[PDB]
Design a protein around this ligand. Structure first.
Ligand code: 5Q7
Length: 123
């Protein structure tokens, strides 16, 4: 049961998203971009993504693994680099800080999940 629990990642990701929502650096990324108030957003960005959407996808049970959740979170940050590419921008700096924060904390979630998969496959 608890060692190598292949479902433990879900609550760990719920907790990491709570930390992200607390971060002042997440303010621009908490909700979808208003496509009326930024009419050129979709001219640039193919697939919008934001932390409320990630949080709801997880709650609905629509991620099969923490790697699928990580892919959507990384899309938030690649979308930000595409839409706000200037390294002079304070929004660029916020995006980089929050991405480093997410990458640090998701690392062990992924590592542990993959170790658990390997153990159950072996046995
Ligand atoms: C976060 C975007 C949806 C909109 C947006 N406002 C700014 C500013 N200021 C920027 N770099 O990008």
């Amino acid at each position: 049961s608890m060692s190598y629990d292949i479902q433990a990642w879900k609550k760990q990701c719920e907790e990491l998203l709570n930390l992200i929502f607390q971060c002042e650096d997440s303010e621009p990324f908490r909700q979808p971009v208003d496509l009326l108030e930024y009419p050129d957003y979709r001219d640039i960005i193919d697939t919008p993504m934001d932390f409320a959407t990630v949080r709801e996808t997880l709650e609905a049970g629509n991620y099969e693994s923490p790697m699928e959740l990580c892919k959507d979170v990384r899309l938030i940050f690649s979308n930000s680099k595409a839409y706000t590419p200037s390294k002079r921008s304070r929004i660029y700096s916020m995006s980089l800080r929050l991405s480093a924060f997410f990458e640090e904390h998701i690392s062990s979630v992924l590592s542990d999940y993959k170790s658990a998969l390997r153990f159950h496959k072996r046995n």
